[PDB]
Design a protein around this ligand. Structure first.
Ligand SMILES: [Cl-]
Ligand SMILES: [Cl-]
Length: 175
């Protein structure tokens, strides 16, 4: 298979098929392998980027995940001061996901690569290796609830949060 974004090495994780044919998807089991340290000797740091709206995140998310639904906040958190590994031997990996990991997640993943390319001299990148969690939180929760907190799932279209949805969207750069 191809090398990661900066052509330095091969992708570390096993992938599964996903809608966006050019993106790399991983399963909930692989996500757990990362969380349980199965790759601790190679992966120095990995960040789980939850791109769902705040109320969805507050209703239940993956342990250690960071809520970065707005592009400007994701850019600030990831690129203002790039997350670097302990050594040049270990990797830094990003995992993006949303509710179904169908639209918001893939979009943010593409946005970050766009910005990474912009601030680098080809072919270097701060985040050469990025994946999308197949199925999003919706499929992850029913499989590994004890790796979530709180142990619940609040859908974007939850009936009691229609106002929260509108309030948040009016904060986005484009719709
Ligand atoms: Cl998909
Ligand atoms: Cl935005």
């Amino acid at each position: 298979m191809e090398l990661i974004g900066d052509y330095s090495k091969a992708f570390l994780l096993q992938t599964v098929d996903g809608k966006h044919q050019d993106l790399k998807y991983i399963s909930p089991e692989t996500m757990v392998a990362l969380l349980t340290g199965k790759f601790s000797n190679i992966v120095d740091k990995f960040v789980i980027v939850d791109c769902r709206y705040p109320y969805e995140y507050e209703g239940g998310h993956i342990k250690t995940a960071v809520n970065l639904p707005l592009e400007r906040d994701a850019e600030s958190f990831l690129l203002k001061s790039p997350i670097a590994p302990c050594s040049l031997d270990k990797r830094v990996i990003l995992i993006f996901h949303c509710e179904f990991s169908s639209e918001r997640g893939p979009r943010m993943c593409r946005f970050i690569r766009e910005r990474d390319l912009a601030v680098n001299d080809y072919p270097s990148l701060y985040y050469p290796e990025m994946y999308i969690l197949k199925g999003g939180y919706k499929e992850f929760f029913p499989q590994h609830p004890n790796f979530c907190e709180p142990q619940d799932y609040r859908p974007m279209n939850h009936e009691a949060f229609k106002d929260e949805l509108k309030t948040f969207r009016l904060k986005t750069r484009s719709w």
